[PDB]
Amino acid sequence: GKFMKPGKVVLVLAGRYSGRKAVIVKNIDDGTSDRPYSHALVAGIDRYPRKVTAAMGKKKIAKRSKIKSFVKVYNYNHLMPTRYSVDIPLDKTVVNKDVFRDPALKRKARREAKVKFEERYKTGKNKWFFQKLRF
Amino acid sequence: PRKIEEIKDFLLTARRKDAKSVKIKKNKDNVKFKVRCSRYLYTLVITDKEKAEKLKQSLPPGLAVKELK
Amino acid sequence: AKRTKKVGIVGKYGTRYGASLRKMVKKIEISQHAKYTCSFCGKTKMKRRAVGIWHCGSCMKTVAGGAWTYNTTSAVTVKSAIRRLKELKDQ
């Protein structure tokens, strides 16, 4: 049955963020008037955390563990769905489709995803999600 | 040659330290203010004669001003 | 209408070179200029780029083929022979 649901890990196929990994936040399989096609709101990693090793100091590890996130609404045709799911609770009051009216809300939407991603990254869970696909 | 559209930017151009002279050419339809900077000859085309006179009297000092005939 | 009775494509040579040579080269001229079905995409687009080199304009796949025909009888026989020996090699 239907599988393009919130929490699904997807690969961006087209655009600036092509080849990056995101997670479906909101999925609209029937579209709207503004988007007759079926689309989803996803939050993804613009820049992945750099590899870290025991040879580095705490300051170096923290510097290399920062994440640059992005928020986008994508056509289903531009996303490759995977079998991985990431259950990061992203506040939908700030991560939603209204963030595209003004930059001020979009900055707080990308900020919200950045903090949640980094927190989940440091626990060692969802390692595949935070590794850059090599193509 | 570069064309400037607004009096605000032309005045900034005429105040540049490398601006040499301002030539005013009066045509039948417009008044053209050309300032010879280092690289380009910037031009401002003013269609209102009163503004051309107003701009003429509000040029920065020390800049050579020439009226073409 | 039908313009020639028998010369066909080798009518470009007029009366020259003799009937038998024109007859013999007629088989090749048709074959080396035909467009073959591409086994990779299915569109009738496989065309000869040079002697032995066959290219498809749809999928852009190039194939090492025969001189005048897409694949030769000798080569097709060898592929089946090499297939059988492989099975009897690893059982």
Place this chain on the structure above:
Amino acid sequence: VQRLTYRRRLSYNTASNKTRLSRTPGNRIVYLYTKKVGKAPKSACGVCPGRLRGVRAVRPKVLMRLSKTKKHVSRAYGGSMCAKCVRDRIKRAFLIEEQKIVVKVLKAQAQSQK
């Protein structure tokens, strides 16, 4: 009617001696020497026949004085690989990497029973 002469000592119609006619403020026709036609980049995939988009079609040494934005596209491999084949490598890279896990799991799972 007015007839033309070359303005240079190269009297031959070589690839570097092409011209175009130009009427001047003095109201005469003269030869202007044209620049060669530049070619947009060819996709690194080597498969797509067309050239890329969003890139100036200029001579190779003219790219030196162009800004970066004029020479690439805002995307991975942008300006070197076409979008169509970039979508295909992301899928291929992901899909092939998954099959390794599928194969690896069976190998261990089969070995586990073994």
Place this chain on the structure above:
RNA sequence: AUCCGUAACUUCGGGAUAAGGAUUGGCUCUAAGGGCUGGCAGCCGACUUAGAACUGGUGCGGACCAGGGGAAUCCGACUGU
């Protein structure tokens, strides 16, 4: 150049402009062949083809340009040197 007509032989491609006829000026017309705008109306237009009358002391591809042809025999296939 237009129209008609074209044999032996042939490797069926040719032979072929085979061979052989008629016509051709000037002038005045007729018909057909399109585009734009709002089975029709309006306004634009660019050269062609065909047909007819009239006409000159039968002269009209008026200068220039511009294949003579047919039936055979020997040699070499041809183009090329």
Place this chain on the structure above:
RNA sequence: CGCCGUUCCGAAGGGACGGGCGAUGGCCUCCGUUGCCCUCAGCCGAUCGAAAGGGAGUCGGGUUCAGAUCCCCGAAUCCGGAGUGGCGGAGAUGGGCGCCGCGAGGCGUCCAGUGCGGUAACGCGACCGAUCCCGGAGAAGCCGGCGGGAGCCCCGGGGAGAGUUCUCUUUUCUUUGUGAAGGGCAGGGCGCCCUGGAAUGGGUUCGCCCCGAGAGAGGGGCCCGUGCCUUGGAAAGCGUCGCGGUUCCGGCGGCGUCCGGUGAGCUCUCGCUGGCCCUUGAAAAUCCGGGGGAGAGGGUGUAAAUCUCGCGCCGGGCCGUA
């Protein structure tokens, strides 16, 4: 005497980001330079070889007895250099918490910040990053057809000067501009994207040819724009009429430099598509993008590293040129 040989019997590298030790210096602060060491390193062939091949970047007007894309006037451009290489812009000025106020906003703290927009093609003025790797350009034959743009030719009118005028001819002739570079827009091309799903198959060219591997139909994006408008630039040039002067003055003034049509036309050029090959139609200098992420940059600021963005500063030697 020499010859063969040109990567083949060769210890064929005198280089580099970075790091470590000293020696010196200067806007002595801290940054340079230098020597040694560490580390890293394919190119694998010295050199020569084209005034028609490759190869950044100059055009308009005037001027001489004889030279000018070289001189002068005007307007540009490439390359290299400056970090005492200057300014602006970008990176970059956000959020949470707690106090002041009615608010605007202000203080103290704790966090982020190597840009952003579009579903996409891709766009925006920049928008860090080395060794290393991948690719692009330079860089590709001949012939046909068709189309777009130019120059020229032709047609209809307006001007200005000239010819003919015994008769006729609103007539015949001449002439009737706008450079490079920048911006804007036509036009041409796209094997580029999005929606959608097509047989009663449709679309389509002179020919073709195209489609469930996505046609028609809509809506976009990109490339070239040598065409037109504009800055250049009317001040110049030209035509004509008229005035001066030293009269060997870039002399001075009036008017004009206008409006349309058409073409298997010729010449050039750009583009699309096809045919031919037992023929497949250079190389290199040189330039560019991408993948990677070793590194560097500042702790919330007079912000830093950094910048292929806009300006500004300095220079371009040699030989040829009648």
